Design a protein around this nucleic acid. Structure first.
Length: 171
RNA sequence: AGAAUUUGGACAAACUUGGUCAUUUAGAGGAACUAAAAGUCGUAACAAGGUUUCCGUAGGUGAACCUGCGGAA
């Protein structure tokens, strides 16, 4: 029993140079066997005779999606971690500057929402992936959807301050 | 045609000398109207929203990396 994760040709060279830190938790912590098909540009994970294949698939799928090495190791460990993918889909007007509104100047809005909601976000052209806990993904996604659908920067930043406080608060 | 006697002298800028119009009074009076300001400390209020990871190309190049431009997720 096996899984195949297709590595796109824009995350291929980081996979090869950081490959030597990717396969050791895949081959001794997880006890899988791992091959990298250079023909199909894919990663194959097979099970030996001696429920972790989905964990390894999510590990390399996070790296495939665009999350860094330590972020992917954080997904491989830390059972309470999830990752949500969505396109914008809500062109000059709407597509070419809603993503500029998520980013901001030097990505400071994305950095602010990452630190406020304790997720971390990779923003493609229009493909947003979010790695966090369940409630953390909920709040980061609500704020990202907010500032692609139109909200004032004061409103989204006040909501970010408030969500940081209430997510870290007991009671 | 010069020159002065002129040949006759109309013309005449500047100087005396009464009224008209505009303005200054050295200024001083009169008797009207209108106006008259007592309140620590108050800001930077003032403003837009292209990040990650590759790929090509031009330049700066230890051909590494950076920057600009063009694409991909």
């Amino acid at each position: 029993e096996s899984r195949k994760i297709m590595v796109p040709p824009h995350r291929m060279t980081p996979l090869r140079n950081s490959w030597t830190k990717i396969y050791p938790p895949l081959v001794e912590h997880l006890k899988l066997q791992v091959r990298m098909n250079l023909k199909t540009k894919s990663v194959e994970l097979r099970t030996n005779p001696k429920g972790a294949l989905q964990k390894g698939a999510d590990f390399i799928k996070a790296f495939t999606l665009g999350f860094d090495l330590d972020d992917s190791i954080a997904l491989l460990r830390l059972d309470d971690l999830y990752i949500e993918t969505f396109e914008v889909k809500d062109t000059g007007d709407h597509l070419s500057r809603a993503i500029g509104r998520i980013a901001g100047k030097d990505g400071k809005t994305k950095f602010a929402i990452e630190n406020a909601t304790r997720t971390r976000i990779v923003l493609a052209d229009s493909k947003i992936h979010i790695l966090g806990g369940f409630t953390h993904i909920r709040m980061a996604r609500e704020s990202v959807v907010s500032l692609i659908l139109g909200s004032p920067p004061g409103k989204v930043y006040g909501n970010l301050r408030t969500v940081a406080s209430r997510l870290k608060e007991r009671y």
